[PDB]
Ligand binder design. Sequence first.
Ligand SMILES: [Mg+2]
Ligand SMILES: [Mg+2]
Ligand code: NA
Length: 327
Amino acid sequence: WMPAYACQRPTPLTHHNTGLSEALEILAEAAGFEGSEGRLLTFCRAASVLKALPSPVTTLSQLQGLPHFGEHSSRVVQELLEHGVCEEVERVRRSERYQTMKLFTQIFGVGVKTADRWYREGLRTLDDLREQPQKLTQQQKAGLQHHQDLSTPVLRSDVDALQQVVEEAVGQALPGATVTLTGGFRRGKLQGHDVDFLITHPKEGQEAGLLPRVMCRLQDQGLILYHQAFERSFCIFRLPQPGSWKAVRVDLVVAPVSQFPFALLGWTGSKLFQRELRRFSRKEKGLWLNSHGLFDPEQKTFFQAASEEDIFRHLGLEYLPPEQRNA
DNA sequence: CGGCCTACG
DNA sequence: CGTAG
DNA sequence: GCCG
Ligand SMILES: [Mg+2]
Ligand SMILES: [Mg+2]
Ligand code: NA
């Protein structure tokens, strides 16, 4: 009754097992900080199964038969049901390793590998890193300077204002080009830690060379606090605030219109949903999916899609709107 | 046991 | 190495 | 860590 892949079931943004899923996600995150991608995936998948359930789990019984619940994830749930806390989860939460790896990986320009090296070198705080600025790339310097602003969520109000400024630059760069809001906001989130836009043009090929032209125009308007032929730009933008402004992460992506459904699908997420969807495509259907297309490796052909609905149909999956992709 | 998404900057 | 979802 |  519960399918094994997250792309086979609706997953709403809000649900009935919030505390249980949050605890499993702490363990998933900690597994990632240790380089255990397999354990991260299992804990993420188990958390996502709980998000997809129609009511709260109240008894351990109710996990029997659910995919991705074995001895470890079931024991976590059991401890939470019986005591309101799970000792393993709380030990992770308060550990110096978890807290520092979380802080460091939050920095734009710092991943697990860099964070882990710094941790092993004895660094623990953002001010530790600031004192050693020759250890830092230009990207990391920007991430560190702007870390406080980037730690505060963006509201949907802010997003609409940003979209209008991006649309103005895009229209000068290439009249007729369009801007679509993707990422978590397209899935219905009311807040988020960045904003994602997908840009195309209805005439195939006109979008070639577009992103540099857009970036130059936004920089000329004084809106770009940090960036840098290309088709994805990971920026920090100046967002107006009453009497001042704040830094916001914005991603801009260009795709040809032939690829737009695939890029829209990919950039709308969630991250787990897209990993599960690509895994399903390859392992169950023998087709290879990315943000550019869907390849049949036996006929050596690409599926044409005119819509996300087309892609779900190609893959034999019932359509899920973005609001049900919150795996 | 092997496998765990698949790209671009 | 970083980034994305 | 779990699935197949
Ligand atoms: Mg986003
Ligand atoms: Mg983003
Ligand atoms: Na980071």
